[PDB]
Write a protein that binds this ligand. Structure first.
Ligand SMILES: *[C@@H]1O[C@H](CO)[C@@H](O[C@@H]2O[C@H](CO)[C@@H](O[C@@H]3O[C@H](CO)[C@@H](O)[C@H](O)[C@@H]3O)[C@H](O)[C@H]2NC(C)=O)[C@H](O)[C@H]1NC(C)=O
Ligand SMILES: *[C@@H]1O[C@H](CO)[C@@H](O[C@@H]2O[C@H](CO)[C@@H](O)[C@H](O)[C@H]2NC(C)=O)[C@H](O)[C@H]1NC(C)=O
Ligand code: NAG
Ligand code: NAG
Ligand code: CA
Ligand code: CA
Ligand code: CA
Ligand code: CA
Ligand code: ZN
Ligand code: ZN
Length: 705
């Protein structure tokens, strides 16, 4: 043991050669977790004239020597490069001095350097790095420091009228390291004893209480939390924004720029993701701008490994979504991450912003994500700009609702494993008759942690006239709460697929929407037959439906359907009528009124489910172009049937676009697989040129024998 001083008496006389400007006292004690009696420290107050520093006697050091101490510079978060404290050593009895730990980033080959692979700041302690005291430890193993050396904490020389930042040090230990360096979770005493930090225990502070397996900061909440151990140089701001609403964390000061997380349980973590903007101006960022380094530590910050360097470039000055998979080596019960932008002097050439930090996920193979939105769990719903947990449109409890004024509206799920048995099933609503606007909400998937998003359902006509997104969540058909069930296509299969509901900008405030009763997974069977919802691996049937998978009607289905369309379409015959209304515009199609589809949005007609086991035919009268004739083949109405409650459809007839300029009669013999105990029909027009364009009419439907 070479040197120990707690300053709790006064200073130990033999320890120190000099301490100009230093006086025993208290500095910034009220955050400190240490005992009150221990708060006595060596303080260097701003107004002291002359040198501000403290120098040790000459000591004999070796590769196993550490310097360990606690420091507070400035008792604030007002970050500054002015008058930092430098920890230095001298090999010539104080004639010359050098930083004990150099700044290590990318070293020149023209010079002698001790830096190796690990990127780290120097033993320089800047004002406004943190309000709290902190422990620093420097190990000599890498420093080629052996023999007689003296050390100093040095700030500067200050004439009268100077006002450098006040600082203080405490609990200085210089001597042999402790075993395992106390795993970076304790203070070493004499190399023989570890004094463990809270939540760490045992001889070497190896054993940890469980750490959280998830971190979120959107910077809309508190800036003092258990989430970050350091937030040096970052302030909440709306400047240099990335997202359309809310604060970001903004680095626009000098000194240290370093954001350090608490220790996390990342043993099953999949990802770190965040938004970042490197540079805030219209031109190209200054080429001297130093990169933001993302690093991790397994040992309480004793050593750091690189995840990614993010360089300033001609394109970096636009907000960007960033996501990385958590590598195996970073996955432990106790891993912290940091974002650090190096600088040799505490000066920076550009600001930067970070926002919406999420760390977590789960690599253990989970195949199910479900929610009724009784709560909004951040671990399941990663991003939801514009979205609020609240009731709307007579929802079952709360829903996730996009109603407030916003420039961005989307919601992203966490990742799940998707396989051949996977399906997506949600309730969705648009504006609930608040607006009559025609709009759609995109449903998308990513297999790369949100780096790219692709439409879940592709434009693919069963006629193969058009094939390559298909608008599904549309505001007329889904005006009020409506269920959709989609088998997940092969291209979505992976061990980590996530989903996004996206309202592309620009959109109007009144074009609102919501989701509820979400199930994405491979449970239940038959996707509940179109007549129920999967809840915790069990089908919950709609009213009037029963059986294990909701395939059994409580009351016998009709065996025929007939409609002359001389009265308003009835829910006894029709489940859906969008874009169609009874009129005489077509003349007689069969007779009197016809159901005329000329709406500017969806044009869709769906029957109730029918028992067609013994039925023989479907027939109807049909006309195109009562107003404007269809201009191409993809505008042909498709007649399809479903035997699974509208989940999947089978083409029966393409009602060819350039036919039926005069009313015609269609008579089709039902195929075997359309003759089931529960089957529905739909007429839908995949494309049209809008209101009163490429219109069609139907009359005298008969599905019978
Ligand atoms: C699906 O629909 C078929 C009809 O195509 C149903 O089969 C029919 O079931 C009814 C019972 O409600 C039987 O009706 C009875 O017919 C006798 C004939 O003399 C009459 O005396 C009774 O008063 C009554 O009307 C009918 O025989 C039978 N037809 C056939 C071809 O079997 C069937 O029940 C339906 N399936 C499901 C799953 O509900
Ligand atoms: C990570 O995901 C896995 C899912 O594979 C979770 O482990 C399951 O947890 C539930 C508890 O409700 C059990 O019913 C399963 O039997 C567990 N399976 C396995 C393989 O252990 C795990 O809980 C998730 N981690 C966290 C912390 O949420
Ligand atoms: C550490 O060594 C110093 C030598 O000055 C001694 O005063 C102190 O009691 C020792 N501490 C422990 C806990 O061994
Ligand atoms: C970015 O801008 C600088 C100066 O405007 C230019 O010289 C440089 O080549 C640009 N970078 C790239 C790769 O386009
Ligand atoms: Ca003390
Ligand atoms: Ca934010
Ligand atoms: Ca709900
Ligand atoms: Ca009619
Ligand atoms: Zn590097
Ligand atoms: Zn999109």
């Amino acid at each position: 043991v070479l040197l120990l001083d707690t300053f709790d008496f006064g200073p130990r006389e033999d320890n120190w050669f000099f301490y100009p400007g230093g006086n025993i006292g208290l500095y910034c004690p009220y955050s400190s977790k240490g005992a009150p009696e221990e708060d006595s420290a060596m303080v260097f107050v701003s107004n002291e004239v002359g040198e501000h520093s403290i120098t040790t006697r000459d000591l004999s050091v070796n590769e196993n020597t550490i310097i360990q101490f606690e420091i507070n510079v400035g008792c604030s978060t007002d970050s500054s490069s002015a008058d930092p404290v430098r920890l230095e050593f001298s090999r010539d009895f104080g004639a010359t001095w050098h930083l004990l730990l150099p700044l290590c980033y990318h070293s020149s080959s023209l010079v002698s350097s001790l830096c190796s692979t690990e990127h780290h700041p120097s033993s320089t302690y800047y004002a406004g790095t943190t309000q709290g005291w902190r422990r620093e430890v420097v190990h000599f193993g890498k420093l080629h420091l052996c023999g007689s050396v003296r050390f100093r904490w040095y700030q500067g020389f200050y004439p009268a009228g100077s006002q450098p930042v006040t600082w203080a040090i405490d609990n200085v230990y210089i001597g042999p390291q402790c075993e395992e360096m106390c795993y970076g979770h304790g203070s070493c005493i004499n190399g023989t004893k570890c004094i463990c930090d809270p939540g760490y225990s045992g001889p070497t502070c190896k054993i940890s209480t469980k750490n959280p397996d998830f971190l979120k900061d959107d910077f809309e909440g508190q800036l003092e939390s258990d989430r970050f151990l350091l937030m040096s140089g970052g302030k909440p701001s709306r400047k240099c924004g990335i997202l359309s609403s809310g604060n970001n964390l903004f680095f626009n000061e000098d000194g240290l720029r370093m954001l350090v997380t608490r220790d996390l349980d990342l043993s099953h973590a999949r990802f770190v993701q965040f938004f970042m903007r490197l540079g805030c101006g219209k031109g190209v960022p200054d080429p001297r701008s130093q990169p933001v380094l993302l690093q991790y530590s397994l040992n309480g910050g004793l050593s750091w490994s690189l995840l990614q360097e993010f360089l300033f470039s001609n394109s970096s000055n636009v907000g960007r979504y960033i996501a990385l998979e958590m590598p195996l080596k970073a996955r432990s019960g106790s891993t912290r991450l940091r974002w650090w932008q190096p600088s040799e002097n505490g000066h920076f050439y550009s600001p930067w912003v970070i926002d919406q930090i999420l760390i977590g996920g789960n690599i253990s193979g989970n195949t199910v994500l479900e929610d009724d939105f009784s709560t909004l769990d951040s671990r399941k719903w990663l991003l939801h700009p514009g979205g609020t947990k609240m009731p709307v449109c007579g929802s079952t409890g709360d829903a996730l609702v996009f109603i407030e004024k916003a420039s961005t509206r989307y919601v992203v799920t966490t990742d799940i494993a998707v396989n051949e048995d996977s399906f997506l099933q949600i309730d969705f609503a648009a504006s609930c008759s608040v607006t009559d606007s025609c709009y759609a909400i995109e449903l998308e998937y990513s297999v790369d942690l949100g780096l790219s998003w692709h439409p879940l359902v592709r434009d693919c006509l069963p006629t193969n006239v058009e094939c390559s997104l298909q608008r599904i969540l549309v505001s007329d058909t889904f005006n009020k709460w409506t269920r959709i069930t989609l088998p997940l296509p092969s291209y979505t299969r992976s061990q980590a697929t996530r989903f996004r509901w996206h309202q592309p900008a620009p959109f109007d405030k009144q074009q609102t929407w919501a989701i509820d009763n979400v199930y994405i997974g491979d449970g239940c069977l038959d996707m509940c037959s179109g007549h129920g919802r999967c809840v915790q691996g069990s089908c919950v049937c709609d009213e009037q439906w029963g059986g294990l998978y909701c395939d059994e009607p409580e009351t016998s289905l009709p065996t025929q359907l007939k409609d002359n369309f001389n009265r308003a379409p009835s829910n006894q015959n029709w489940l859906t009528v969008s874009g169609g209304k009874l009129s005489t515009v077509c003349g007689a199609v069969a007779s009197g009124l016809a159901l005329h589809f000329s709406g500017g949005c969806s044009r869709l007609l769906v029957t109730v489910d029918l028992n067609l086991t013994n039925a023989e035919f479907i027939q109807f009268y049909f006309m195109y172009g009562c107003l404007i004739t269809p201009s191409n083949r993809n505008q042909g109405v498709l007649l399809e049937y479903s035997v699974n409650g509208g989940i999947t459809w089978n083409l029966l007839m393409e009602i060819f676009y350039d036919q039926y300029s005069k009313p015609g009669f269609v008579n089709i013999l039902l195929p075997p697989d359309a003759k089931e105990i529960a089957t529905r029909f739909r007429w839908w027009q995949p494309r049209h040129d809008g209101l009163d364009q490429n219109d069609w009419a139907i009359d005298n439907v008969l599905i019978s024998r």
